[PDB]
Amino acid sequence: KAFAKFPSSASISPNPFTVSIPDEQLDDLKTLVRLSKIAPPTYESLQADGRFGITSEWLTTMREKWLSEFDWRPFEARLNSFPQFTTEIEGLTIHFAALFSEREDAVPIALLHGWPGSFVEFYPILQLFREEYTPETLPFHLVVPSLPGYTFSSGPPLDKDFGLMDNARVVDQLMKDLGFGSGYIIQGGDIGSFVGRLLGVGFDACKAVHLNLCAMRAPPEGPSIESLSAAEKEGIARMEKFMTDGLAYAMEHSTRPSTIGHVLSSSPIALLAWIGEKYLQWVDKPLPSETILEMVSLYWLTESFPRAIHTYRETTPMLQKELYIHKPFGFSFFPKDLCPVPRSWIATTGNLVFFRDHAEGGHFAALERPRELKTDLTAFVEQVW
Amino acid sequence: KAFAKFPSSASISPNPFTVSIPDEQLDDLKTLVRLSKIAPPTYESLQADGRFGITSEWLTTMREKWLSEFDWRPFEARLNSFPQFTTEIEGLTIHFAALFSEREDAVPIALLHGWPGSFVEFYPILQLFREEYTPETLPFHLVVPSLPGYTFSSGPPLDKDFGLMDNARVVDQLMKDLGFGSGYIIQGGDIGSFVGRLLGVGFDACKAVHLNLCAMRAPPEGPSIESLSAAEKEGIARMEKFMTDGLAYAMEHSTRPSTIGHVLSSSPIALLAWIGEKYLQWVDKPLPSETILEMVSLYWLTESFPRAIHTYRETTPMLQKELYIHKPFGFSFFPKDLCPVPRSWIATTGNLVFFRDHAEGGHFAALERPRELKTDLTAFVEQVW
């Protein structure tokens, strides 16, 4: 119950949430993993560098671990180690984890995840704050919502389209319900960075934004590639490779969400192969295999995939004009992220007053480099709030 | 045994082939279809027009038919109704169906399938020839090979890359082995049209080529879009939509063949959803549901998918120069095919001496309009041989 008390200005009632997956669901997951088949070996699946996707060796090993080493209960207990709640917004059940401070002057911050992530991606950071502060000394209110369509949050709606602006509207309303209408800051990566930009652009309660992803093309009337250094050019090269050789998954999410939704819902191995590839290719240092199995099992048990990809038709079909962030804007650069563009480019998309360049780390910053992201966010808030 | 005798000039021995899937394999297929799960309904899967891919209604209905109405034996008997053989080429087992004439002057023709097709796509055409001729009067030798990686043909190799040129080399060698080194003609659609073009371009034994697909962009120094009619422009519009909204599947096949190969090998429902979408969207008039189930079951039982997509990295990463077809070139235009470009454009890619424009029909011409494709091919051969 420590860090679980709602701010005095919150207008909603606390509805504590606990993850409790029935044994039957875990048994059926195991059964389906066991019955699932693996593709026959091919030239492509035998390439150790995995330039064609996951290897047969990796998938075979993971399937075996999922059946003999994997245990959901310990992970579930970990999920339940932090305060969690649910509240209804526009008919949707919105789940969120949080660490609330008892300090009246604490700065409200919403940490937004992306795909194939979830609220759990921020647990390592919440853990650091919990180890370093007490409810009476915590400088911030940390809210980690599950975006519509992800894990324990329901939706999106079945009778109407839902996009990035709708996601932004839900996040802003949640913060207002928790009593942060006078102001809050947003931290976002992946899809959360798209939502975060929209919040910084059109929602007044959002006072500042810190992102670790700025997907963009060469600026209009700004710095050209020829004005960039060797290191910055290597980054642009990596971005071009991602946009040409690494975006197929996104194009399928965007153009045929119904088909891929059904494909990945049919077998847990299908889901593991598709999402696992990203947990393997988007990081700097390899993640523990059990971490990947936990994340995939979480998506499977909550039927997240088919509901979460609705935003791809908008992120994967301006930044200097209509979507320019006029409010204090901060950025944390990790070299192995998907689109490592230079500071000069990011600076054209908003009032960039804070920039931190890191030597290591990939796409899942909160998971890979929690100390660095936490440290960066703290410095940003202290500077602009 | 009618139409099964090899030409007198064949250098290889006939190895009759028969399809015989063990009951156990059929039982496991049924079991996996039953245990497979379907995605929860979403806004996207409830769209009747299916602009986002297959609908929940369709997949649910097909799964039910697969379990209660589908019977493999009758289809298998149909597969075995025509002469089939296997032969080894470069270490690969190459399967092929055929109707051999007893006439010494019969024109050798190889009919090449594509993805998600197979040799069976040409059975309706072989059926028409068998009903209209006897071995003594058949004017052509009709060879329908299974390209490397498809159904009963093995490969591609596990220790080296394999591409379109390799496929062309195998087809040319097969025809030579059957004794057609003095000359043969090729008919091709989909991937078969890419292989067919390469055969017309660099293999001397190939005397002429007839295609029903000519994937291309606006010609270099040739006819512009402004020089096209209203009908032709509508065709170009359909091609642009396919290239922008309908190519995601190909981009995944091209960039991450290992991942998607494993994804679709995990469950028969995953395979049905992915391939079924194409059998639904690429045709003019809807195909019988049982036909789709038969084709998908064939791919499943032969583990075709992961092995067949190797060519996408080359078809989905010139036509006026290096790949220009100097030999007699013919084309059959079906309005609902994937890339319906105008005759003026196709004419820039080869010595086009034959063109047939049809009012109806889609991508699977051999399946959809067998009478038309057969007659077009016959007219072409008579004109250029």
Experimental approach was X-ray
Asked if the Cβ–Cβ distance from A266 to B266 is below 8 Å, we say yes
Amino acid at A191: I
Which one of A256, A303, A312 makes the best mutation probe of the B interface by having the most chain B beta carbons within 10 Å?
A: A256
| Cβ-proximal residues to A150 (8 Å cutoff; 6+ apart), any chain | A113, A118, A119, A302, A304, A307, A308
Instruction: Please give the Cα distance from B49 to B39 (Å, whole number).
Output: 18
Place of tokens 């994804």: B263
Give contacts of A166 with chain B, Cβ < 8 Å: none
**Does the beta carbon of A274 lie under 8 angstroms from any beta carbon of chain B?**
yes
Say if strands B140-145 and B107-112 run parallel, antiparallel, or are unpaired.
parallel
Type and span of the H or E element at A331:
strand A325-333
- Tell me if B99 sits within 8 A of B82, measured CB to CB: yes
Rounded to whole angstroms, how far apart are CA atoms A336 and A238?
9
* CA of residue A108 relative to chain centroid, distance: 19
In angstroms, rounded to a whole number, what is the distance separating the alpha carbons of residues A245 and A50?
13
- Tokens at A214, concatenated: 């700025």
User: Do the Cβ atoms of B43 and A149 come closer than 8 Å?
Assistant: no
Asked if A246 lies within 8 A of B255 by C-beta distance, the reply is: yes
Q: How far is CA A95 from the centre of its chain?
A: 14
In angstroms, rounded to a whole number, what is the distance separating the alpha carbons of residues A318 and A324?
A: 8
CA distance A205 to A207: 6
> Count of alpha carbons within 13 Å of A283, Cβ hemisphere only?
20
Residue B198 structure tokens:
């390469």
One-letter amino acid identity for B163? G
Phi and psi at residue A308, in whole multiples of 5°?
-80, -25
- Candidates B111, B78, B106; CA nearest to B96 is B111
B-chain residues near A161 (CB < 8 A): 43
Mutation target to probe the A interface, by most A beta carbons within 10 A, among B256, B278, B305, B312 is: B256
- Cα-based angle A315, A321, A326 (whole degrees, multiple of 5): 95
Please give the C-alpha separations between residue B183 and each of A72, A373, B329, B348, B380, in angstroms, as whole numbers: 65, 68, 15, 25, 15
Specify the pairing of strand A107-112 against strand A350-357: unpaired
Sign of CA dihedral A275, B48, A160, B244: positive
Domains and CATH numbers, chain A: 1-385 (3.40.50.1820)
* A-contacting residues in B 289-308 (Cβ below 8 Å): 303, 305-307
Resolution (A): 1.8
Q: Give me A360's structure tokens.
A: 């290591």
CB atoms within 10 A of CB A338: 21
For the record, the structure tokens of B278 come out as 């194409």
Phi, psi of B336 (to 5 degrees): -90, 15
The pairing of strands B92-99 and B140-145 is: antiparallel
Q: Cα separations (Å) of A270 from A300, B253, B375?
A: 10, 15, 44
Nearest-angstrom CA–CA distance, A316 and A72: 33
Contacts of A150 in chain B (CB under 8 A): none
DSSP β-bridge partners for residue B95: B86
In SS3 terms, chain B reads as CCCCCCCCCCCCCCCECCCCCCHHHHHHHHHHHHHCCCCCCCCHHHCCCCCCCCCHHHHHHHHHHHHHCCCHHHHHHHHCCCCEEEEEECCEEEEEEEECCCCCCCEEEEEECCCCCCHHHHHHHHHHHHHHCCCCCCCEEEEEECCCCCCCCCCCCCCCCCCHHHHHHHHHHHHHHCCCCCCEEEEECCHHHHHHHHHHHHCCCEEEEEECCCCCCCCCCCCCHHHCCHHHHHHHHHHHHHHHHCCHHHHHHHHCHHHHHHHHHHCHHHHHHHHHHHHHHCCCCCCCHHHHHHHHHHHHHCCCHHHHHHHHHHHCCCCCCCCCEEEEEEEEECCECCCCCCHHHHHHHEEEEEEEECCCCECCHHHHCHHHHHHHHHHHHHHHC
Task: Report the distance separating Cα A85 and Cα A145, nearest Å.
Answer: 9
Residues B235 and B340 sit within 8 Å (Cβ to Cβ): yes
Look at strands A107-112 and A84-89 and give their pairing: unpaired
Distance CA A59, CA A39 (A): 10
Cα separation, B211 vs B191, whole angstroms: 11
Q: Do B248 and A269 touch (CB under 8 A)?
A: no
Give one DSSP letter per residue of A123-151, joined into a string.
Answer: HHHHHHHHHH--TTT--EEEEEEPPTTST
Strands B206-211 and B325-333, by their bridges, are parallel
Catalytic residue ranges of B = 190, 312, 363
* Strand order from edge to edge, sheet including A140-145: A84-89, A92-99, A140-145, A107-112, A184-188, A206-211, A325-333, A350-357
Query: CB A204: neighbour CB atoms within 10 A?
Result: 10
